[PDB]
Amino acid sequence: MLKAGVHFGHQTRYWNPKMKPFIFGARNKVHIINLEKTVPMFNEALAELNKIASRKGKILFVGTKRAASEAVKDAALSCDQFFVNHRWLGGMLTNWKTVRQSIKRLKDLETQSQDGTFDKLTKKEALMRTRELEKLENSLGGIKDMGGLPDALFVIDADHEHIAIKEANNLGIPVFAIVDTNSDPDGVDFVIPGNDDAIRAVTLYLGAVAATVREGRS
RNA sequence: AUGGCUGUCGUCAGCUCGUGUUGUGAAAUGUUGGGUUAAGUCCCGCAACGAGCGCAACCCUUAUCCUUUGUUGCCAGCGGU
Ligand SMILES: [Mg+2]
Ligand SMILES: [Mg+2]
Numbered sequence: 001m002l003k004a005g006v007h008f009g010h011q012t013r014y015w016n017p018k019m020k021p022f023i024f025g026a027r028n029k030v031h032i033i034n035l036e037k038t039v040p041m042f043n044e045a046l047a048e049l050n051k052i053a054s055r056k057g058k059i060l061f062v063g064t065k066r067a068a069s070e071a072v073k074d075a076a077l078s079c080d081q082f083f084v085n086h087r088w089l090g091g092m093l094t095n096w097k098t099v100r101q102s103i104k105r106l107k108d109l110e111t112q113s114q115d116g117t118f119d120k121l122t123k124k125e126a127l128m129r130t131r132e133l134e135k136l137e138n139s140l141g142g143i144k145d146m147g148g149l150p151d152a153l154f155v156i157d158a159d160h161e162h163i164a165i166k167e168a169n170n171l172g173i174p175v176f177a178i179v180d181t182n183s184d185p186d187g188v189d190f191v192i193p194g195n196d197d198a199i200r201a202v203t204l205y206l207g208a209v210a211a212t213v214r215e216g217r218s
Numbered sequence: 219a220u221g222g223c224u225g226u227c228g229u230c231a232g233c234u235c236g237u238g239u240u241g242u243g244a245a246a247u248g249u250u251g252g253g254u255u256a257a258g259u260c261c262c263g264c265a266a267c268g269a270g271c272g273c274a275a276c277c278c279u280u281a282u283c284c285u286u287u288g289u290u291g292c293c294a295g296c297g298g299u
Contacts, residue, residue, distance in 0.1 A: 090248095090266030095238040098267055163239090163265060170239095 001039055005188060007204065009033055012182040019181055022193045031181045032065035038193045045176045046188040046212045049152065053216030057151025062164055068156050075206035076142060079214055083142040093167040096149065103144050108138050126189025152176065154209060157196055158183035178205060
């Protein structure tokens with residue numbers, strides 16, 4: 001709400017012409033983001049997220065770029081919600097019947113990796129199990145407790161995970177995702193202009209959204 | 219006209235299916251890409267996520283040792299020839 005003004009961003013020298021009504025002219029061969037349309041649009045998204053959080057809709061925090069890959073996990077897991085920080089598996093939302101079998105394996109291997117096998121088979125075989133355990137856990141993480149399809153999708157990056165936005169679009173899942181000056185503002189339910197690939201910027205949204213979801217919990 | 223049983227490509231490393239996505243469609247992706255192996259063998263990336271038949275292992279023989287038994291098999295230490 002025009003507090004710090006630290007998400008100018010500009011994301012590149014060039015632009016995306018579909019982002020014309022959300023920019024301010026910059027002489028440094030870059031493109032400003034107009035905060036006047038940024039603040040109210042963020043407020044609308046927060047209000048609708050509060051609206052839908054009253055039914056435990058399982059909001060998803062999807063930030064994959066290495067800048068936000070930790071802050072997203074913190075702001076999602078450590079408070080109430082799910083997340084996807086590593087590579088978005090192709091079709092994990094629409095090929096749900098096939099993806100769920102992987103989470104079943106993750107749960108079984110987690111059960112057998114605590115009081116299970118330590119010497120029953122070869123130590124290198126247990127190492128293979130641990131290797132697969134880490135590979136499956138880091139890629140397929142917080143969504144492990146998912147009951148099925150979610151209700152909302154909060155996507156940190158804009159262009160990085162177009163397959164995530166399209167996967168949500170195939171269903172009737174609303175999408176709240178911030179959009180840079182070089183991204184595509186179409187197909188996203190709630191346009192939020194702003195910079196993404198910065199530490200401060202992602203933390204701003206991951207704090208605001210986290211507080212809103214916490215207060216909408218009950 | 220067939221069953222069964224064989225050779226061959228070739229012991230070559232390939233051949234496929236389910237769901238998802240792409241294309242009006244035939245089809246494609248998975249199975250491509252950077253490395254490595256004898257092998258789509260393995261790892262990392264990745265609109266793909268998994269599974270099957272293959273490869274490897276599971277099997278017989280050979281290279282060393284330990285245990286059990288000592289015949290029609292053996293003769294190191296003891297005595298007679
Ligand atoms: Mg093919
Ligand atoms: Mg194989």
